[PDB]
């Protein structure tokens, strides 16, 4: 009578042990999924940051090229003006 009561205690203890091991397994699976998705979204966010850095650097380089092209065109026109002036002086002299 007493022995059967402690027998139910024994059954509950062993079965609690099995259920607890299964809970640990599910917890490990949940932790692994959380780890992998957080790592993935982190890498995606880093890719976005690299993308914006490249965008701003590209804008800087584009403005540099615009300035270089404008100054080169202005220099070429000044050179042409000097060439025409000097040809005129050649004619006169």
């Amino acid at each position: 009578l007493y022995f059967s009561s402690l027998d139910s205690s024994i059954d509950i203890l062993q079965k609690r042990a099995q259920e607890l091991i299964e809970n640990i397994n599910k917890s490990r699976q949940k932790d692994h999924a959380l780890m992998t998705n957080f790592r993935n979204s982190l890498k995606t966010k880093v890719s976005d940051l690299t993308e914006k850095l490249e965008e701003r650097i590209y804008q800087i380089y584009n403005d540099h090229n615009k300035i270089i092209q404008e100054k080169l065109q202005e220099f070429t026109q000044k050179m042409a003006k000097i060439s025409h002036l000097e040809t005129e002086l050649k004619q006169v002299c």
Binding site: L6, S9, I10, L13, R16, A17, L20, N23, I24, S27, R28, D31, L34, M35, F38, R39, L42, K45, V46, L49, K52, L53, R56, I57, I60
Partner: protein
């Protein structure tokens, strides 16, 4: 040029914050695992109590 400096520093800031948030996540999950360790401890206590009564 100014914006490049601001955004470089901000990028470093965001990456460090994100990696520390990852570390915190990792610690919290490990803490859950340790809690299951303590549950095993409780089962051990119950086993020892039953054994003590059975001895006497």
């Amino acid at each position: 040029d100014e914006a490049l400096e601001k955004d470089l520093n901000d990028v470093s800031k965001e990456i460090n914050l994100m990696l520390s948030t990852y570390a915190k996540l990792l610690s919290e999950r490990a803490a859950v695992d340790a809690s299951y360790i303590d549950e095993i401890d409780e089962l051990f206590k119950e086993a020892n109590a039953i054994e003590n009564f059975l001895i006497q």
